């Protein structure tokens, strides 16, 4: 009645033989079915029963298992392999799927490309100020954003939205806005949007005076 999927996420590069299993609470005599759920789209029945690849499915994908365990080996990753995967218990109601694993693909390091923007003339007149800071195209997602109100200070009111591993580009491109008081902003001048990734041992900064036009 309960089934768990191994490795919540897995970062592999193409050609790498990746495998992930699914452990179930009781015996479910080969009644599991792995579903492939690519981002922004509906799941797809990958394999059913023990293995037996569903029609329209690559030889690389492979299932295995019996009672408490159920593997799903994939000799070689791909672009067609970026997605979440989770086993589906089908022995007896209530049916319960695994926790789902997220197969992130590896592609060797790539530094970000920051770009700080000062709050628009339209927002500032309604009270409030949104300093945005896009750090596009970079790998991995292991990075830390650090804002500086003027001199050297983070503050709260930061919104850090990432994005999913691009399909062809294979890179995260997280943004990081920062909202605050209109005049609080006016009380300060130079806004620094520091950022520390792995790639560059040194920090990547970008900012502005505020006295820019």
């Amino acid at each position: 009645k309960c089934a768990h999927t191994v490795s919540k996420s897995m970062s592999m590069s193409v050609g790498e033989r990746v495998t992930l299993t699914c452990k179930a609470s009781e015996n479910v005599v080969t009644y599991v079915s792995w579903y492939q759920q690519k981002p922004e789209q509906s799941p797809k029945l990958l394999i059913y029963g023990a293995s037996n690849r569903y029609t329209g499915v690559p030889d690389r994908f492979t299932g295995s298992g019996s009672a408490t365990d159920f593997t799903l080996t994939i000799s070689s990753v791909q672009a067609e392999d970026l997605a979440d995967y989770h086993c589906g218990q089908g022995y007896s109601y209530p049916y319960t799927f695994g926790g789902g694993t997220k197969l992130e693909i590896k592609r060797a390091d790539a530094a970000p490309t920051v770009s700080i923007f000062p709050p628009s003339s339209e927002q500032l007149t309604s009270g409030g100020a949104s300093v945005v800071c896009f750090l596009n195209n970079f790998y991995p997602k292991d990075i830390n954003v650090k804002w500086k109100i003027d001199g050297s200070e983070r503050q709260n009111g930061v919104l850090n939205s990432w994005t999913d591993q691009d399909s062809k580009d294979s890179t995260y491109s997280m943004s990081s806005t920062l909202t605050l008081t209109k005049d609080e902003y006016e009380r300060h001048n130079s806004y620094t949007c520091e950022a520390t990734h792995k790639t560059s041992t040194s920090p990547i900064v970008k900012s502005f005076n505020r006295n820019e036009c």
Binding site: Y35, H86, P94, F97, F117, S120, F134, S161, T163, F208
Partner: protein, 434 residues
């Protein structure tokens, strides 16, 4: 070979709504069909489940007797009747079909929320100028404060799609907000414009925001001006027409001059006679948006004093007529100022500084000038009021001199000189001493 789900968006906590996963591409009535959901970054949770005919109808915990799974095999459609909606039901609901749950539909996202449908605000993100290097000016657009989701951000009406990065919306105290970036070449931006086209479906707010660069500083005033300039002739300072060693210059200057009006060619007339100025033409000075040509022609004292006119004829290309204006005198019978002196008052005698006023009265005309003289030469501080017409029709002016007690009590003697035409030899002066 497909099934897609219908209506199911935002609902108040507790209330109800019905979604209908519609099918096609085969025989419906011979198939078992479930419904499954998935909440934010969560796993898959199986829920209802009907069967071919409509016999078995296995539901589950989180929705027993509170969600009802109908069917209508006849006209291909599965259903779900979410009733008592606990906020923790907010998710997207799929719709499969057994065999082993192979064909899942698209999914409709419900949001069990007490919040009100709030339309956002677009804030275009233009870079802080700087230097447009690397040929790639990345732009962005900000959508803040919209409820609920989702929103469709498209760049230049979906035309642009090279390298854009729309950002996963984030909830912040009952308010959603996100942004989108767009990598483009440097050159096209300044020139060929870029707009941010977005719409909040659940609100119907289609909006297009132009991404103009940061509005800069010094903007050309360039106020617009009609049919040519207008000249003004100003009289010489009384002190010039009085002090003999000083030469009384009479001015006349034009104003509305564009980047066309030539040197103008100034010419004066001292009683229907014409004369050579003194090449008085410092001319054109880039003013507010137009220039200004000066003509400071000096003239003999006695001329003005006797009372002679001063025409300032000028001729330009744009000029519809060679205009000129005189500036003779003030007329009337000249009255000399009585001019007196009043040392600092009793009341003010303990202060740091003091005020000795020079009271000139009942004279005519206002053409007069005043100076003081501490020790025995030209001093400072002294200020003069402006000629004001008293009762009878005359005038009078006060001249205040400021100094310290040490200076005053030290009997250093101060003098007030007044220059007015009605004066003996065009001048008089009185003196104060402790």
């Amino acid at each position: 070979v497909k099934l897609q789900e219908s209506g199911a968006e935002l609902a108040r906590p507790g209330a109800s709504v019905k979604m209908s996963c519609k099918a096609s591409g085969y025989t419906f009535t011979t198939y078992t069909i479930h419904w499954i959901k998935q909440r934010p970054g969560q796993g898959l949770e199986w829920i209802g489940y009907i069967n071919p005919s409509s016999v078995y109808t296995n539901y589950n915990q989180r929705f027993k007797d509170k969600a009802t799974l109908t069917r209508d095999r006849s006209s291909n459609t599965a259903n779900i009747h979410l009733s008592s909606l606990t906020s923790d039901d907010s998710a997207v609901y799929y719709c499969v079909r057994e065999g082993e749950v192979p064909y899942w539909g698209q999914g409709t996202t419900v949001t069990v929320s007490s919040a009100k449908t709030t339309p956002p605000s677009v804030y275009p993100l233009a870079p802080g100028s700087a230097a447009q290097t690397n040929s790639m000016v990345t732009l962005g657009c900000l959508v803040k404060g919209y409820f609920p989701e989702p929103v469709t951000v498209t760049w230049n009406s979906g035309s642009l799609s090279s390298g854009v990065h729309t950002f996963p919306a984030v909830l912040q105290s009952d308010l959603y907000t996100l942004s989108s970036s767009v990598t483009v070449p440097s050159s096209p931006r300044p020139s060929e414009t870029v707009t941010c086209n977005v719409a909040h479906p659940a609100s119907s707010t289609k909006v297009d925001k132009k991404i103009v660069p940061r509005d800069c500083g010094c903007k050309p005033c360039i106020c617009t001006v009609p049919e040519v300039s207008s000249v003004f002739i100003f009289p010489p300072k009384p002190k010039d027409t009085l002090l003999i060693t000083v030469t009384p210059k009479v001015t006349c200057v034009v104003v509305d001059i564009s980047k066309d009006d030539p040197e103008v060619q100034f010419s004066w007339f001292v009683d229907n006679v014409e004369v050579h100025t003194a090449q008085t033409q410092p001319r054109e000075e880039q003013f507010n948006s137009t220039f200004r040509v000066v003509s400071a022609l000096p003239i003999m004292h006695q001329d003005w004093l006797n009372g002679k006119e001063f025409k300032c004829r000028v001729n330009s290309a744009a000029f519809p007529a060679p205009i000129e204006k005189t500036i003779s005198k003030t007329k009337g019978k000249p009255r000399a100022p009585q001019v007196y002196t009043i040392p600092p008052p009793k009341e003010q005698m303990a202060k740091d500084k003091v005020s000795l006023t020079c009271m000139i009265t009942d004279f005519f005309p206002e053409d007069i000038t005043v100076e003081w003289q501490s020790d025995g030469q030209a001093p400072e501080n002294y200020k003069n009021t402006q000629p004001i017409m008293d009762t009878d029709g005359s005038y009078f002016v006060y001249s205040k001199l400021n100094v310290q007690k040490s200076n005053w009590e030290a009997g250093n003697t101060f003098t007030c000189s007044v220059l007015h035409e009605g004066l003996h030899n065009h001048h008089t002066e009185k003196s104060l001493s402790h």
